[PDB]
RNA sequence: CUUUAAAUCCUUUAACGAGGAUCCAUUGGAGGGCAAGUCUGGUGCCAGCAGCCGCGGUAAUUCCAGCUCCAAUAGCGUAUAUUAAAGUUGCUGCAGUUAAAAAGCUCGUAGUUGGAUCU
C-alpha cells in the first residue's frame, strides 16, 4: 500500500462494510451505498447534508442489513432512543 | 482420524511399515519373488543362443506378423522370445547364433501389439543390428 | 592410495522442459547478440547467477546485524562490484536480486574487445581472441569467456607479437610478397 | 489466397488430421 | 460509433468518468465493452487458450458446436477471462473477446521482503477454487519469475505479476477449470484484508449522484 | 631449447602448412504429448512404425527413400537400478455415504490422550 519511500503504490483503495468491516470488491454487485438526509432542528426540512452507509452483499443476503442500518442510524443520532 | 500425540512415533512408523506393503511397486521390489522370476536376474542385457525363428501375430485391431526369435539364455538356461526390431533384420539372424538381448522398454511389461514379448535383439555375433541394417558392418565369415 | 585429487564440479544445469518455445527464442537471442557458440554457454552464466541469487536469499533471512550476514554480504557485494556487474553506489543485499544475465554477459573479453573498437563485430572479436591477437596487461589471453575485472578495462590491447601490433606479418603476406 | 485454417479445423476436427488442424489454427490465432 | 444504452456508458462517453478504478470503487456492473475499450484500449492484448468442440446428441446424428476460451490483459494490473460457445469458430472467438473484456478485474501487487520500487508479487498467499481444481499463489523473491504451469502462467503475466510460486491440486487437465481457478485467485487480491487497509473508509459521492444534472438533461 | 632419474606431454620458438565435393560433425526426429512438411516417389491391414493415443485395406501429415525443415552438439541414442514428478505412502500432507475402503455389537488390559486452580 506504500513502500519505504512513503509513496502510495496501491491502484485504488476499496470500500469497507459499515457493518462487518469487510472489503467490498469490484464484482460485489449486491453491495449498497445509501445516503440518509439530515434535517434542521427547528423547521425540520432537508438541511442539504446527509450521512452515508455502505452494506455488503453477504450481510444483506443474511437478512441482517435491516438491523445493521438501524443500529448505525441510532449511533449517529438520527433515530430516537428506543 | 490419525493419532497426533508427542509419544506416537512408534505407532506412526509401524503403521507406515505395514501400509507400505500394499504399494505394488514397493512389494514387487522388496519381496524377492519378482527377482527370482526375472530371466535376466536383475541385469539389463544378457547373451543367449538362438533356437528357432518364430512369428507372432499382432493383437487387434492391428493385423501383421511381428518377427521374433526364440533364445535360450547362457547363464541360467532359461528360454525367452525376443523381437527383431527393424525392416528385414530377421534375415541377418541364423539358428545357433549367439545374440545380445535387452529389455524392450517397460520394465518387464509387454509393449504394443506384440503379445507377451519383453525383450529385443541388440547384437548378432558381436555385430550390432544397427550397423548391419545401415550397411556399416557385415556378418563375420 | 594415490597422491591425486578427485574434486570437480559441473558448471551448468539443463532446463527441465526441452522444447519450450518461449525459452528457445529467448536463449537464441542472447546467443546471437553476444556471439556465443552453443546453448551450454548460456546455461553456464545462468547457473552462476542462480547460485549468486541463492546465497543472497539465504543471507537475507538472517538478522540484519548477524555477524555472518555482515561478513559474507560485504564479500559478495564487493566481488560483484569488482567485476563491474553491480554499481558502486548500490551495495545493498536487495540489489543483487535485480541483476540479470545480460549484465554478466557484457563483461566477457569477447564483448569488451568489440566494444573497445578492436574488432568490427562480435564474431570478429571471437576469432581475434582465439587467434592470440589480444593481451590484458602484458599477458596474452585466448579465452573468450575471460571475465574482465573493472580495473583491467584499460589494459586490453593488441598483442606485442601480432601483425596488428608491432609484430611481423603472418605467413600469408610473407608468402605473397615473395610471389611477385 | 492460401488455405483457411478456420475451415480446415471445422471440417477436420474429428478426423485423422485433427491434431494438425488444431496446431495450424492456433498458429493463425496466436 | 458508440451510442451508449446504460447511464454508465453515457457518463464515460461524456468525459465525466475518467478512470476505471472509479467504477471499481463502487462495484458497479459493467455491461458495455466500449467502456473497457475507452480506458485500456491500446494496452490490451488477448490470447486464445483452447478451442473445445462439444456435441449434443439428436435423432439425426450429433450436433457440433465450438467453445473458445480467451484471456485478456494489459500487463499492468488488469486481467480478464471469457468463454463463449457458438456454431462457428470465428463467431465464438469474436464473442468470447467481448466477455473477456467485460470480466476485467484489477490485481493487487505486493512485496516479498523489503519495499523498494514498484510492487512485483502477490500481497499474500491466495487460493482459487473451481470444480475440483485448487490453485495456490505464494509470494516469491524478486527476479525469480513465475514458477507455475504453462496455463496459469499466461494469466499471471497478463495481470502484471512478475514473481510468484504456484501449486495446483485436482484435475488440472481440464484447462477450463484450471484457468477459472487461477483467475479466481487473482480476483481475491483486492478482497483480502491486511493491516494496510485497516483505516476507516471515507465515502465519496457516487457518479450517479455526482452527475445527476448531466444525466437528466442528456 | 625446456621438462624429467631418463624420457613422453603441455608451455616457448625457427622452417613448411587453407578456397569450397575441403583440413567435408554427428546423433535422433518432422500427427499429438513435444520444436519441426496434409511436399514428391514406392508399398497397399503386407512390409513395417509405434514408450502412450495410434499409422498402414491404391490420393499414408506417422512405413521405405529424396529434398527441405529442428533439437543438442564432439557428442547423441538404447536397456536397466534409482531420485524428483508422487499431496499415487500423506509427520508437514491423502482417503473410507454412492468411485478401493468403518470391525455385527459391547466390555476390557497394555499403548495413546487427559478440565479450573497457587506472585
Ligand atoms: Mg509442434
Amino acid at each position: 500500500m506504500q513502500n519505504d519511500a512513503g509513496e502510495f503504490v496501491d491502484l485504488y483503495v476499496p470500500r469497507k462494510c459499515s457493518a462487518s468491516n469487510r472489503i467490498i470488491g469490484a464484482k460485489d454487485h449486491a453491495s449498497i451505498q445509501m445516503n440518509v438526509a439530515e434535517v434542521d432542528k427547528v423547521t425540520g426540512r432537508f438541511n442539504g447534508q446527509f450521512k452515508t452507509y455502505a452494506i455488503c452483499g453477504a450481510i444483506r443476503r443474511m437478512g441482517e442489513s435491516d438491523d445493521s442500518i438501524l443500529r448505525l442510524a441510532k449511533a449517529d443520532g438520527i433515530v430516537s432512543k428506543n | 482420524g490419525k493419532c497426533r500425540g508427542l509419544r506416537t512415533a512408534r505407532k506412526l512408523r509401524s503403521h507406515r511399515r505395514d501400509q507400505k506393503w500394499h504399494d505394488k511397486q514397493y512389494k514387487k521390489a522388496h519381496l524377492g519373488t519378482a527377482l527370482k522370476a526375472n530371466p535376466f536376474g536383475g541385469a539389463s542385457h544378457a547373451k543367449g543362443i538362438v533356437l528357432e525363428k518364430v512369428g507372432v501375430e499382432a493383437k487387434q485391431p492391428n493385423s501383421a506378423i511381428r518377427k521374433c526369435v526364440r533364445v535360450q539364455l547362457i547363464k541360467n538356461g532359461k528360454k525367452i522370445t525376443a523381437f527383431v526390431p527393424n525392416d528385414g533384420c530377421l534375415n541377418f539372424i541364423e539358428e545357433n547364433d549367439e545374440v545380445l538381448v535387452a529389455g524392450f522398454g517397460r520394465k518387464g511389461h509387454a509393449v504394443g501389439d506384440i503379445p507377451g514379448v519383453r525383450f529385443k535383439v541388440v547384437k548378432v555375433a558381436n555385430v550390432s543390428l544397427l550397423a548391419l541394417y545401415k550397411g556399416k558392418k557385415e556378418r563375420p565369415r | 592410495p594415490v597422491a591425486r585429487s578427485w574434486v570437480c564440479r559441473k558448471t551448468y544445469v539443463t532446463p527441465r522442459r526441452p522444447f519450450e518455445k518461449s525459452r528457445l527464442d529467448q536463449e537464441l537471442k542472447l546467443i546471437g547478440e553476444y556471439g556465443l557458440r552453443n546453448k551450454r554457454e548460456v546455461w553456464r552464466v545462468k547457473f552462476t547467477l542462480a547460485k549468486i541469487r541463492k546465497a543472497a536469499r539465504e543471507l537475507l533471512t538472517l538478522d540484519e546485524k548477524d555477524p555472518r550476514r555482515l561478513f559474507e554480504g560485504n564479500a559478495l557485494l564487493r566481488r560483484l562490484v569488482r567485476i563491474g556487474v553491480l554499481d558502486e553506489g548500490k551495495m545493498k543485499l536487495d540489489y543483487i536480486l535485480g541483476l540479470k544475465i545480460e549484465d554478466f554477459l557484457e563483461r566477457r573479453l569477447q564483448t569488451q574487445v568489440f566494444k573497445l573498437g578492436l574488432a568490427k563485430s562480435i564474431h570478429h572479436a571471437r576469432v581475434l581472441i582465439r587467434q592470440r591477437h589480444i593481451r590484458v596487461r602484458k599477458q596474452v589471453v585466448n579465452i573468450p569467456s575471460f571475465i574482465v575485472r573493472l580495473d583491467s578495462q584499460k589494459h586490453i590491447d593488441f598483442s606485442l607479437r601480432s601483425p596488428y601490433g608491432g609484430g611481423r606479418p603472418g605467413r600469408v603476406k610473407r608468402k605473397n610478397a615473395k610471389k611477385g | 489466397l492460401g488455405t483457411d485454417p478456420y475451415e480446415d479445423f471445422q471440417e477436420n476436427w474429428n478426423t485423422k488430421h485433427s491434431s494438425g488442424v488444431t496446431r495450424e489454427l492456433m498458429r493463425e490465432l496466436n | 460509433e458508440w451510442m451508449p444504452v446504460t447511464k454508465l456508458g453515457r457518463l464515460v462517453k461524456d468525459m465525466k468518468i475518467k478512470s476505471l478504478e472509479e467504477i471499481y470503487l463502487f462495484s458497479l456492473p459493467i455491461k458495455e465493452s466500449e467502456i473497457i475499450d475507452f480506458f485500456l484500449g491500446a494496452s490490451l492484448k488477448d490470447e486464445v487458450l483452447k478451442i473445445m468442440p462439444v456435441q449434443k446428441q439428436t435423432r439425426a446424428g450429433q450436433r457440433t458446436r465450438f467453445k473458445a476460451f480467451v484471456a485478456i490483459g494489459d500487463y499492468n494490473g488488469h486481467v480478464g477471462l471469457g468463454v463463449k460457445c457458438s456454431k462457428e469458430v470465428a463467431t465464438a472467438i469474436r464473442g468470447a473477446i467481448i466477455l473477456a473484456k467485460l470480466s476485467i478485474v484489477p490485481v493487487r501487487r505486493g512485496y516479498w521482503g523489503n519495499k523498494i520500487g514498484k510492487p512485483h508479487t502477490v500481497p499474500c498467499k491466495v487460493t482459487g477454487r473451481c470444480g475440483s481444481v485448487l490453485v495456490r499463489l505464494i509470494p516469491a523473491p524478486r527476479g525469480t519469475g513465475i514458477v507455475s504451469a504453462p496455463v496459469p502462467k499466461k494469466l499471471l503475466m497478463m495481470a502484471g505479476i512478475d514473481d510468484c510460486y504456484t501449486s495446483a491440486r485436482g484435475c488440472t487437465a481440464t484447462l477450463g477449470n484450471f484457468a477459472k481457478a487461477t483467475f479466481d485467485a487473482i480476483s481475491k487480491t483486492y478482497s483480502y484484508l491486511t493491516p494496510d487497509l485497516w483505516k476507516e473508509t471515507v465515502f465519496t459521492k457516487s457518479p450517479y449522484q455526482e452527475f445527476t444534472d448531466h444525466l437528466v438533461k442528456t
Side-chain angles (χ1 to χ4, degrees), chain C residues 21, chain D residues 19 23 27:
Chain C
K21 184 88 152 151
Chain D
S19 43
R23 181 197 76 235
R27 266 160 163 183

Side-chain angles (χ1 to χ4, degrees), chain B:
Chain B
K2 43 202 208 178
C3 47
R4 279 192 192 135
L6 268 178
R7 291 153 173 151
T8 300
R10 183 177 293 114
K11 187 82 171 192
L12 303 181
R13 185 179 67 189
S14 302
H15 188 235
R16 194 41 77 224
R17 276 210 299 282
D18 301 335
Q19 291 306 290
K20 276 191 286 186
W21 288 108
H22 291 97
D23 203 342
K24 68 181 178 67
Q25 301 299 108
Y26 179 92
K27 182 147 205 193
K28 183 175 174 66
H30 290 265
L31 197 75
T33 56
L35 190 53
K36 293 182 183 292
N38 192 9
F40 282 1
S44 62
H45 297 79
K47 278 191 223 185
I49 299 291
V50 164
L51 302 159
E52 180 200 329
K53 278 177 193 214
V54 301
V56 182
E57 65 183 1
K59 287 151 47 140
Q60 286 280 120
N62 289 296
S63 188
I65 294 171
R66 310 278 166 253
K67 292 174 176 55
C68 304
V69 65
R70 192 86 193 175
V71 173
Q72 196 188 15
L73 288 199
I74 283 161
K75 66 183 205 180
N76 47 18
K78 284 192 218 297
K79 308 218 207 201
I80 63 168
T81 305
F83 171 61
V84 189
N86 281 285
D87 198 319
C89 282
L90 193 85
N91 292 325
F92 295 121
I93 312 188
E94 201 69 29
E95 278 177 19
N96 277 117
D97 269 17
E98 183 178 1
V99 292
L100 187 68
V101 172
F104 186 68
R106 285 190 70 180
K107 282 74 197 186
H109 200 288
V111 182
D113 305 345
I114 301 168
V117 169
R118 279 149 275 283
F119 305 107
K120 68 167 153 194
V121 179
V122 174
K123 296 169 78 179
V124 176
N126 290 318
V127 186
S128 87
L129 275 186
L130 188 152
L132 283 168
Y133 183 78
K134 291 174 71 175
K136 289 168 193 285
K137 285 171 203 215
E138 192 38 60
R139 290 192 45 120
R141 302 293 177 90

Side-chain angles (χ1 to χ4, degrees), chain E residues 97-109:
Chain E
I97 291 186
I98 289 158
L99 270 57
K101 277 175 169 185
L102 285 163
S103 298
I104 282 171
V105 296
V107 191
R108 196 188 184 188
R109 288 168 285 184

Side-chain angles (χ1 to χ4, degrees), chain C residues 63-77:
Chain C
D63 201 38
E64 310 86 44
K65 280 181 312 291
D66 197 320
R68 194 159 65 86
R69 190 174 148 156
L70 282 71
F71 188 74
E72 271 149 36
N74 291 320
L76 183 54
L77 283 159

